[PDB]
Amino acid sequence: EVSWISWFCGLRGNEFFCEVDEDYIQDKFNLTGLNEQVPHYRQALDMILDLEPDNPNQSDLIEQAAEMLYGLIHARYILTNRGIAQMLEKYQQGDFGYCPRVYCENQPMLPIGLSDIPGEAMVKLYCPKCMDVYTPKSSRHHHTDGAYFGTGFPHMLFMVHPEYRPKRPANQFVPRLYGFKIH
C-alpha cells in the first residue's frame, strides 16, 4: 500500500527529504552517471520504483544501495521546478529548522550540502539572512549525506522565488562591559 519513496521519506531522520516523482526517475536522462556511483544499480532502481525483484541476507545491501541512489536522485530533483515547489512547502512549514543566530530572529533555513560528492560531509543548513551555514541541532540528522542535497539547492530556490529572500538583520551583537561598548 505504501510506496518505497513515501516510506523512506517518512522515516525518522529523513525529515529533510521530499518525495521525488516517479516520472522524474523514469526518465533515464535524469539519471546519467549514477550507475557508476551505485552498486547493484538496476536492483536499487527497481526497488525505489516498487517493481518486482528476484533467500539472501544480501538484499539488505540492495536496500542500502536503494537509499544512496534515491539520495543522489534527490539532489538533482530539488533543482527542478517541481522539486523546488515541494521543498518550498517544507520551508514554509519550518521543516528544516531555524537559524540559531540571535540577530537572525529565527529565520527559517534550508538544507544544503558542502559537497556534491558522497562521503565528504553530512547535510548542513543554510540561513539566507546571515548567508552562513550551520550544523543541524538534532542528531537524527548527523548521518544524512549532504550530497543528497547538493551545494546549489538553496541558491536555486531563492533565484526562482526571490520574494522569500529576507531583509538584512535590523540589529547585531554589541559587546558591552559594565555598561561600556568595548572592542
Cβ–Cβ under 8 Å, residues 148 and 120: no
> Which of residues 50 and 132 has its CB atom nearest to a second copy in the complex?
132
Q: Is 33 left (phi over 0), alpha (psi -120 to 50) or beta?
A: left
**Which residues would be at the binding site for a second copy (CB under 8 A)?**
100-103, 114, 116, 124, 131-135, 137, 151-152, 155-156, 173, 175-179, 182-183
Distance CA 124, CA 150 (A): 10
Residue 124 beta carbon to a second copy: minimum distance, rounded to whole angstroms = 6
Cβ 154 vs Cβ 130: under 8 Å: no
In the complex, minimum distance from the CB of residue 171 to Zn ion, in angstroms, rounded to a whole number: 13
Interatomic CA distance for residues 148 and 75, integer angstroms: 5
The amino acid at 119: G
Report in angstroms how near the CB of residue 165 gets to Zn ion at its nearest: 13
Residue 112 within binding range of Zn ion, rule CB under 5 A: no
Q: Which residues bind Zn ion (CB under 5 A)?
A: 99, 101, 104, 127, 129-130
**Binding-site sequence positions for Zn(2+):** 99, 104, 127, 130
